[PDB]
Symmetry: D2
Subunit: 456 residues, 4 copies
């Protein structure tokens, strides 16, 4: 709000409103009231003294939270969970709110619901990007381009084939995100140290009633599975599995955008339009943010390593930051990446220019093989070809002119039984190998199947 105070650039400038809502106070305190409703619903079903009038008024007061009252009662009573019990019970039921449960019933189950929801926003966005990159890869599947190893010219590839290297990495990320989201489990009702003591007390020693309660709220929260063993909170290892797959996504994006930045210099490919000089500013923002995601991994790792026994509260402040800032960063990244993918501009003639410069240095083997087939001796042909290439290399390096190796093998009499066959031995398409067929097979076997559920 105020420009007098520091404002998170991930919150006020970079990320989408959708992701910002999930990590807001309004959504957190709404979920708190939502978890209290489910607790009361399941407790009434199991025989605890709860009247239907207490339930209906909690149901009609889910999105009616007084912040001015809650903020000052938190300053008055120190504890934040109990401060929200008072505020809910004021617009309500008061006697049955949070009965038996501890602070971490709302706080910790909210985090897993927030976590599951945030992953649910990233998935269709990642698929959307992949889909748009897939169309680009299919369109440019046969357009030959100079391949790079050590960032030096190497055996030709296609523009579509190069794109599939990016697509694959994102397809592993989609799969990883989906797995982690599906594997996410509910804490349930566990108590102060995970022994379920206070809940067992209310049900007066009934062990089956506690287990039924643990299955009831888990299904109301939309989780398939619920933890058996926990300390106070869910194991902090969960936060590692989630941030690992995001950091991996960060690495992928960084590689993709660095490729695009290098292609922008070669003037072979640029970012979509709204001038001669164009900076790839969106890819650079992406690289910047991806880096943050890779850094973020050390936070949950260090945390879980130093949790003592059932729970130490030195996870609280660190998780408030790293978890939201992981998803806000990933969110910005995917919005930007989606923007970049919508009509990447390719300049074919610039690509054709770079090929015809380096191509003759790679086609030398084809020439000799064509001399042998006619009747020329390999040994003698190798010595007479490894001499015109050193001349043509000198012109390029020492003098800074265009490549003229093809001309020199047209003005040499020794290479007379090849002059008619030269413009076929230099067809760029006959140097791309199985590149176009690799795209074909990859998109149908691996890419399209994964995109199928996300068709919308």
């Amino acid at each position: 709000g105020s420009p007098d105070s520091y404002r998170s650039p991930l919150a006020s400038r970079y990320a989408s409103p959708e992701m910002c809502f999930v990590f807001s106070d309004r959504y957190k305190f709404r979920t708190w009231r939502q978890l209290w409703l489910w607790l009361a619903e399941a407790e009434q079903t199991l025989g605890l003294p709860i009247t239907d009038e207490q339930i209906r008024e909690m149901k009609s007061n889910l999105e009616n939270i007084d912040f001015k009252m809650a903020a000052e009662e938190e300053k008055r009573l120190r504890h934040d969970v109990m401060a929200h019990v008072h505020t809910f019970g004021h617009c309500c039921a008061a006697g049955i709110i949070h009965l038996g449960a501890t602070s971490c019933y709302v706080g910790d189950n909210t985090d897993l619901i927030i976590l599951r929801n945030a992953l649910d926003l990233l998935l269709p966005k990642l698929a959307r990007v992949i889909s748009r990159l897939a169309d680009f890869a299919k369109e440019r599947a046969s357009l030959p381009t100079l391949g790079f190893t050590h960032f030096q010219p190497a055996q030709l590839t296609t523009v579509g084939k190069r794109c599939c290297l990016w697509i694959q990495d994102l397809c592993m990320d989609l799969q990883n995100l989906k797995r982690v989201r599906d594997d996410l489990r509910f804490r349930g009702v566990k108590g102060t140290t995970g022994t379920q003591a206070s809940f067992l007390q209310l049900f007066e020693g009934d062990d089956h009633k506690v287990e039924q309660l643990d299955k009831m709220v888990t299904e109301k929260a939309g989780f398939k599975r619920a933890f058996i063993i926990t300390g106070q909170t869910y194991t902090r290892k969960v936060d590692i599995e989630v941030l690992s797959v995001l950091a991996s996504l960060g690495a992928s994006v960084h590689k993709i955008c660095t490729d695009i930045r290098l292609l922008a210099n070669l003037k072979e490919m640029e970012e979509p339009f709204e001038p001669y000089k164009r900076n790839p500013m969106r890819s650079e923002r992406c690289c910047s943010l991806a880096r943050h995601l890779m850094t973020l991994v050390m936070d949950p790792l260090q945390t879980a390593s130093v949790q003592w026994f059932e729970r130490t509260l030195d996870d609280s402040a660190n998780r408030r930051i790293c978890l939201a800032e992981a998803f806000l960063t990933a969110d910005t990244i995917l919005n930007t990446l989606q923007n970049i993918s919508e009509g990447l501009v390719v300049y074919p003639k610039v690509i054709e220019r770079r090929i015809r410069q380096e191509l003759p240095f790679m086609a030398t083997e084809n020439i000799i093989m064509a001399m042998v087939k006619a009747g020329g001796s390999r040994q003698d042909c190798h010595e007479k070809i490894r001499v015109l290439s050193q001349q043509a290399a000198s012109v390029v390096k020492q003098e800074g002119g265009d490549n003229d190796l093809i001309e020199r093998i047209q003005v040499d009499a020794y290479f007379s039984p090849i002059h008619s066959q030269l413009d076929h031995l230099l067809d760029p398409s006959s140097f791309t190998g199985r590149a176009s067929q690799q795209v074909q097979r990859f998109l149908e076997e691996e890419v399209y199947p994964l995109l199928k559920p996300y068709e919308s």
Copy 2:
């Protein structure tokens, strides 16, 4: 081998890790596998109609272990190439196969596929080790399932848990590691034959435009390698995302192990539990030190994957020769040392009982107020009456450094008339542990044993 004391010894090779994992990352295994990959290539190429004879095949199959490391290093100096040097040395012990070795292949066919074979082997040696650790902790967790111990939140006295339940926190964290390790081993895919830029250009020229034969070759060497699946899309090498996926689980494992051993170290101070053999928990401190390094190593493959330009840059080669090996050798040492810890953790039941009885009356107060309504007495007048006696009892403990005298105060107090006779039953340690004992039994049978079953051998 244990080299001269004049040179630096890497402690992960001799000082710590098991000779098995050391061998998987050795030059012998590396170059035996190189020659194996050349044998599978020749066999499959002979199947596809290339001029290779049975005699040439038997020659390669016989000389697989016959490696001259001295000559290969000397030829590497001259030829300025590691692979083409080993092609020459293999051709020297195989004079008839010399012509067909590495036909159509590029450097990474042997270089990069060997690292995939190394990864899968290295994971398959870690799994049984991680499972034996889980098993012995599951033995321990069953024995001590109903042994009350003071629970710690904020490392401060809280409601009672059991020793078995505390062990299950450790068990679960290692159980998710087992699942993650398995999943990564199964997801590993063979690179196969791809050529210098992944376009299979060289092999397509060998079969002379025959696209079907090239894809046939790729499947053939993959099956011979024992891989269910191979990549369709690579540059020169398999995507360096695979390193991230592997080392992310080892780093995560390290975080769980570091937690387990920090917990054990703290218990050793409390005298509640100690390691097998004034004693120092050196082996838990050894585990912590190494787990830390295992967590640190994750930033390497992360950064490596982020700066790989196009189809490949060699700015990953040296880094991978360090991070991958060390991660597994570190991961190896940890689980060998952790296995020795889990085999016989010593519990001191009487020391645990002492700490419980000096903290229990402060959390048994609620049961008293509920118990006092049998007569009965008022809820609010009793809440303040027992509250102030705790203020006097906690003052002798902290401000004067003594023992808990709260029980002594209530027994002589005239106000607490009826409750006297049922106090020992009210302070029953088992009636504070909740469902801890039932949580232990269910966790082991529902989740632990089904996971450990495939490792009966």
Copy 3:
């Protein structure tokens, strides 16, 4: 702040209003205007057609910022700096033609970051010194009070409370020195142009090489810096950010160490936080994040291509502010902790008493030899009385009774009864109290002098 939107907890819950302001858009764009004024003033002196009316106009409108207009212009122009040049030129109609004259974007953007970095360090420095000041008082007060030393977190030769506090102080002192050096050696970017060659300023002064050097000197002195970079690309070297976040990350490691000890002492009931050690848990949590952040500028500086790549911007806008707001929060909480550390001597005594006999056995032997005793016929006589006591402590879970077993054996009769002068807790503390004395007088107080 809005409840419907996410808010960075460091700005709305944790850090001080002082630190939050140094990283605000108000401070940022005011400094932009502050740097444009200096440039104009120096350009006038060097002979450019700028009137005092124009400078007077600029000096009057440093704080008069229209953010609404500045945001609308950036959407249109797709440029941060030019938008603010236009907005400043709107409330300064006469100076509009001379704002940002011959300058590049990074003259404001990059020099502002350096100004912000220096200012933020200048707020952390007094706060750190003040923490060290009160921890020094605590170290002097409890300098002689013996406490059980811990190696491997196991009872070892007893030290003193003040001595253990000095281990904390020494780490923080090193931080204070490292924060001072980084702030003092921090340099100004100055005027460098788009690629660091000063080509555009050279053209404005129509070739006059000396005038470009003077303009660089003048804006540096006006900014309050002692030194400027001679060599830069577009921006100051990103190595600078590494050095700053390195000292802060190291400070995080120190803070986490101090707060872990406090968290362990609270468990042992030997020391307490002023009120669960929740303040030390908040400190540990944030210190952890401060250590994480060092990897950002490291990766950022490693992949800077040539004269500059813009893949540093968004990351720095996150990692720099977050580091300082975190650091600020930590020190604030550490101040509160240091104001009210409560020691409980009696609990310390009790723990000492049940471990002192296990560490005093060597002095008993040394007092038995010259009293007429054998070196093995006494060592065995006491070591058996240590085996039975180790069972009472560990197998039975009771009190340590080696302080009881003296009358039991008639062998130790010459020892009756000059003790417990031999079991004096102060006689096992070594040079702990002298070491505290020297440390404060030679190393700590000289550092806290000019604060």
Copy 4:
């Protein structure tokens, strides 16, 4: 070459990569030798203070003679006492005055500090040598115009010498950091089990002054100017942080330089030294790989010091043996390879000139309009004419993949007749370099040469 069988894992940092000097610094031979040298200094200093010690010569002559089997046997039977016994066998005359009243960390921890300082002393001259070589190159190419790069897009011309200065300045800040950390490195001395000097206070019979004189004497004998007053068992693990922080900062600088060389290699502007036609910057690639590891190693000591409980805990021992040794072996290798790259950088002036002429015309438009106004032309007419001709040239480059013909278009247009004679001056590369050459001379004389003078 060193020894090791191919049947076990041999760390490439020791056997394959680093130079023999650094390997010896972290070897067992140097570790145990320094132990005995520290034991000697202890006896000699205790002799000067009054303790019953006589001619010292025996320990002096038996420093090189170490039996590793005897030490390993006693290590299996009982490491410090295993070496007290081994050094107390081949020295029969003196065995009751070795390690007298000292703890396991007098040798083990002070050795760790003599190694660190030895390792830094090998690095310093090596880093100075690289700066010196690069500086020579920078002076030689200080007035050689090259294309400036921002966003890796064409920008205001700089010089080759100037770009080199950006690298030098990074390394110069590294040399400063290393000198400061090495000089401010303190000795642990004598402290005892928990750092109170109790064991020594007993054997000097309560003498305060004598304990403090022993601290100064072994500090002076070790080559240190200063000793710690306050330490626990070992020196504060903050020391590891500061050492590896600056090393991590060096790896970042090296990565930047070597990424630059690699990119220049693709532009064919600059190349690694000889000993064609395709050449790979494999040496710069090795450096980036190794520098990356060096940047990673920083979290090790960071995590270590943060979880040190009280006086000392030995969960640092295994981590420090790895991380410290690795960092200095990696730093050493990097600087050895970076010495190679510096030694005979190949520059291709004509390739550099070709790139400039392709990008300069677009940047030179301001000067052309200035020259046209200077002759009697209109500002608007010239700006519109130069606008239509620049967009025509941009199409030829982008859409057609041809050379930059902007100057040709100006040269054939009759409107530009007033400046046709001026064109070979208006587009002089040197006039676009700004003050680059002057910055090089000033930087080298005021910062580099003073900094290198002590290292001469």
